[PDB]
């Protein structure tokens, strides 16, 4: 009858072996079945679990079911990066109940990069072709740092990514921030979160 | 597998419109819902067969059909703000396993008046000095602003072939405006090479956006270029210095 899923937001370092739960009112189910969906793209099912079943494993996931308890446990082993998605848990009704599935609000999932050597500095990106906009650049900090907004109504800062350069088995976090080619250096900006006191602010 | 249509759509309140979902699987079970912020995975209708059809959760506002096992049509025949949201398709053999194979997404977006529909504008920073000096690494800066709905796709290409090495977009653009429900949007990536790399003049960097906008048919009656759908690009060649 009802989904749940928790936690509904998961952040953990990359290594770590990981734990996501779904539970359901009614245990009169046909099947349970995961799925992970990427921002602004389509349901990937990664396992499904026959009422008859009690275990399912692909890779490095594996899933568990407890009908009479009304819950299921997806584990990933040894979370990697790339393994940041939403993961949904969705149940089919059993004995003519309309075939009509339930899904859960889902579990958005971060695995963050280990970072070997940090190097946090703050950049300043010149021209679009100049005149445009004032580009700042936060990188090569460890994947503890978060990144807050500004307190200014004309600067903006994005969220980090974690960008991977493979020929140098490299890998590095960064976050963007900008304002309008005026009054305002964009290295400022990042003055609203906490960061290492020894980040480097290069004119 | 199951393909609905159109990928992206935006429509002006009252216009009608019809969502299309296809599988060649021969499916006999077939299901439309629509997925919203926080809200979940809403069932609107489905269909356990050819020829039948029942209503689901939220079915106000949507008609749909199944005259055929390979077609479900999900129509709406006067688009409402409300109706905003991702579309999924998804369909199952009637009994075996209940496994949903599920539809790419539809992304609808109504609105009261298409004057809020912005192509994006695109840029590219330069890699800074000081980071190339410092890491012998040399990261460029993509950003697109001023664009509505959030229908587009990002994407780099250095000397005209597409990468994925070094390169991360924000997982989800942000709100120029955050209270508005209707705020443009910006969207930023970051595409990083070596120095050296950067620093070959025949080197040629390209970001393109890909946005999805209004039809070559809509009514536009503004001082401005109609948005419809369109790639806007930004580059930058590198250079010794």
């Known amino acids: 009858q009802e989904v749940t899923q928790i936690p509904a937001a998961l952040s953990v370092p990359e290594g770590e072996n990981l734990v996501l739960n779904c539970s359901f009112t009614?245990?009169?189910?046909?099947?349970l079945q995961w799925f992970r969906q990427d921002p602004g793209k389509g349901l990937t099912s990664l396992l499904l679990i026959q009422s008859s079943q009690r275990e399912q494993t692909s890779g490095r996931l594996n899933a568990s079911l407890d009908k009479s308890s009304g819950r299921s446990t997806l584990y990933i082993a040894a979370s990697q990066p790339g393994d940041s998605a939403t993961y949904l848990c969705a149940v089919r009704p059993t004995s003519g109940g309309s075939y009509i599935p339930t899904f859960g609000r889902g579990t958005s999932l971060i695995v963050h990069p280990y970072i070997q050597n940090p190097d946090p500095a703050v950049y300043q990106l010149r021209r679009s072709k100049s005149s445009d906009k004032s580009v700042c650049l936060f990188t090569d900090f460890d994947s503890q740092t978060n990144v807050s907004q500004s307190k200014d109504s004309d600067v903006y800062i994005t969220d980090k990514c974690v960008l991977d350069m493979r020929s140098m088995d490299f890998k590095s976090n960064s976050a963007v921030a900008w304002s309008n080619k005026s009054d305002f250096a964009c290295a400022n900006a990042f003055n609203n979160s906490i960061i290492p006191e020894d980040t480097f602010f290069p004119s | 597998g199951v393909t609905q249509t159109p990928k992206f759509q935006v429509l002006k309140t009252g216009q009608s419109m019809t969502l299309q979902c296809a599988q060649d699987?021969?499916?006999?079970?077939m299901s439309w819902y629509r997925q919203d912020p926080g809200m979940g995975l809403r069932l609107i209708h489905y269909s356990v067969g050819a020829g039948i059809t029942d209503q689901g959760e939220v079915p106000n506002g949507y008609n749909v059909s199944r005259s055929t096992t390979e077609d479900f049509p999900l129509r709406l025949l006067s688009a409402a703000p409300s109706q905003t949201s991702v579309y999924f398709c998804?369909?199952?053999?009637?009994?075996?396993?209940?496994?949903?194979?599920f539809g790419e997404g539809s992304r609808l977006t109504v609105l009261e008046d298409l004057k809020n529909v912005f192509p994006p504008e695109v840029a590219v920073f330069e890699p800074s000095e000081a980071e190339i000096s410092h890491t012998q690494k040399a990261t460029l800066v993509c950003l697109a602003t001023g664009f509505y709905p959030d229908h587009v796709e990002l994407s780099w290409w250095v000397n005209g072939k597409e990468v994925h090495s070094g390169v991360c977009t924000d997982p989800q653009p942000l709100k120029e405006q955050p209270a508005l429900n209707d705020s443009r949007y910006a969207l930023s990536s970051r595409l990083r090479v070596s120095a050296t790399f950067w620093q070959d003049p025949r080197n040629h960097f390209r970001c393109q956006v890909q946005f999805y906008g209004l039809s070559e048919n809509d009514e536009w009656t503004q001082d401005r270029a109609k948005p419809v759908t369109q790639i806007v690009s930004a580059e930058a060649w590198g250079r010794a210095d």
């Open positions: 009614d245990s009169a189910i046909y099947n």
């Open positions: 699987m021969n499916h006999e079970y």
């Open positions: 998804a369909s199952s053999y009637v009994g075996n396993t209940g496994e949903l194979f």
